[PDB]
């Protein structure tokens, strides 16, 4: 169990860690979060009491170093930083714990939600989507645009998701125009799985990271990317059976975890109705279909 201390909390802010969140008052004596489960990625994220715009946050993995938070009054936000001095860091953490000024990552032992939502997400892959290689953690926010969004401006701050476009040469073999547009199996399996992602665990990991970025930051281009990756699978006649079964679990926990009041902008009517009811894979998502009908029958 690892710790992320905070130097101070000088401004009122709602702090999130994974699917949990805590309200923190201006200059309240908050000095970090402890008992963070090791073995998964995590995200710590912020929304200032004064500006409900710009949700922002940091992906990290505690095995990659000792990380802490410090408010920067020039740039006006909570920044993640790395402490390289192991002993200076154990010292801060121990002293803060002794004074009991740290909240406890509040995991119910029966709960596999965070695992289920990050099964395939790997910190090394995140850092390739969010390129900033001086840091071992990754900053995302509400307003960052994707590479594909930029093609239709500042590349250093972009989400370098894998570009998927159903009406492109990459997706359509000459001479199989109608075939490949109606049955995307060759874009999925040959182009994307074998060619670019190499295996389905990287595909699934990008899908999961996209969803989480849409949920926690309302990042609109992440939501687009998440829908695109679902639709490519659902629109393929030929999908490995191991992938369909896992997809059904993956989507189930995403729909399960989504705030009820956000289903209107985060859920794309066309994609979901096509995947669950018209696509090749209409019958292969029983768990995702049952939870979608019992929780959001309006959208459908």
């Amino acid at each position: 169990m690892n710790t992320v201390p905070f130097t101070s909390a000088p401004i009122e802010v709602t702090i999130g860690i994974d699917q949990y969140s805590f309200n923190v008052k201006e200059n309240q004596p908050f000095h970090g979060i402890k008992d963070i489960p090791i073995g998964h990625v995590h995200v710590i994220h912020f929304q200032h009491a004064d500006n409900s715009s710009m949700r922002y946050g940091y992906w990290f993995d505690c095995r990659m170093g000792n990380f802490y938070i410090q408010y920067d009054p020039k740039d006006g936000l909570y920044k993640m930083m790395e402490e390289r001095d192991g002993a200076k860091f154990e010292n801060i953490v121990h002293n803060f714990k002794e004074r009991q000024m740290m909240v406890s990552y509040p995991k119910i032992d029966e709960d596999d939600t965070w695992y289920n939502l990050t099964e395939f997400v790997q910190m090394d892959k995140i850092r390739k989507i969010v390129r900033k290689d001086e840091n071992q953690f990754s900053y995302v926010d509400s307003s960052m645009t994707t590479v594909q969004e930029n093609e239709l401006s500042d590349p250093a701050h972009s989400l370098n998701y894998t570009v998927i476009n159903f009406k492109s040469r990459e997706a359509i073999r000459p001479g199989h125009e109608m075939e490949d547009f109606l049955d995307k199996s060759y874009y999925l399996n040959t182009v994307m799985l074998q060619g670019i992602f190499k295996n389905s665990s990287n595909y699934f990991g990008e899908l999961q990271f996209a969803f989480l970025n849409a949920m926690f930051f309302g990042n609109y281009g992440s939501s687009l990317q998440w829908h695109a990756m679902i639709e490519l699978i659902c629109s393929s006649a030929t999908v490995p059976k191991h992938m369909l079964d896992k997809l059904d679990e993956i989507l189930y926990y995403q729909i399960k975890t989504l705030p009820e009041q956000y289903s209107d902008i985060l859920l794309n009517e066309r994609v979901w109705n096509i995947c669950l009811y018209s696509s090749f894979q209409k019958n292969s998502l029983h768990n995702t279909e049952k939870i979608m009908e019992n929780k959001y029958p309006e959208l459908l």
């Binding site: 009406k167 040469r169 359509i172 125009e177 109608m178």
Partner: protein
């Protein structure tokens, strides 16, 4: 964007563009079988690809053989249309290739777009107009060449005959849509109007009768009256 009443004059500017109409590509008769069930039999069809500026009709004839052993024919019709239109553009010298292609039915957009991926600078547009090009098979000579064909075949016709020697493209296109609109709403009366006077003949290399200017006015007037009457009948106004 979409083509509509407002941007209508754009058809006649000097940017090359083609209309594509797919209505007559896949044509069937419906009949009963020995056991009483219903069956379709396909007849030859065609793609109606027209430059509204010159009046050049690239009439691609769709032989029934293309359907042999295929399923979901009405969906395939749209792809076969897109394939043939794309092959026509590739066959044309660069200076002749269109800058726009305007599809009369929106279902053609994705098939054409996918077939034209090699032509990123050709814009594929829908339209809000209710153009009468389905009535093209009411033009005797076009219907005849389609019906007689024994193989796939492209046939080139000027749908304006020689009108452009005397009138503008704008006027020519409006005459053409008036004639086709009439043929669509009441073929029998429309055709009666065009051939009544046996002294007005159709040139061998033409589709319509050789009316003088004043006779076209009388004709155009008779076609208007036809269209308006049929509306009253349809709706009881």
């Amino acid at each position: 964007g979409a083509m509509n009443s407002s941007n209508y004059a754009e058809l006649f500017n000097n940017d090359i563009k083609l209309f594509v109409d797919d209505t007559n590509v896949y044509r069937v008769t419906v009949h009963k079988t020995f056991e009483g069930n219903v069956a379709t039999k396909a007849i030859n069809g065609c793609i109606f690809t027209l430059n509204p500026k010159t009046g050049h009709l690239f009439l691609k004839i769709i032989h029934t053989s293309v359907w042999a052993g295929q399923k979901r024919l009405s969906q395939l019709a749209k792809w076969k249309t897109a394939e043939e239109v794309s092959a026509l553009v590739r066959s044309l010298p660069k200076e002749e290739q269109p800058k726009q292609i305007i599809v009369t039915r929106k279902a053609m957009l994705d098939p054409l777009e996918v077939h034209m991926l090699d032509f990123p600078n050709i814009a594929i547009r829908p339209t809000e107009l209710r153009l009468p090009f389905s009535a093209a098979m009411s033009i005797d000579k076009l219907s005849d060449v389609v019906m007689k064909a024994t193989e796939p075949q492209m046939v080139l016709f000027n749908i304006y005959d020689d009108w452009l020697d005397r009138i503008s493209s704008y006027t020519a296109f409006s005459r053409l849509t008036l004639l086709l609109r009439a043929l669509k709403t009441n073929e029998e009366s429309a055709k009666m109007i065009l051939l009544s006077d046996p002294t007005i003949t159709i040139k061998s290399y033409h589709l319509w009768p050789s009316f003088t200017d004043e006779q076209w006015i009388t004709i155009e007037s008779q076609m208007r009256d036809l269209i308006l009457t049929e509306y009253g009948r349809k709706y009881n106004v």
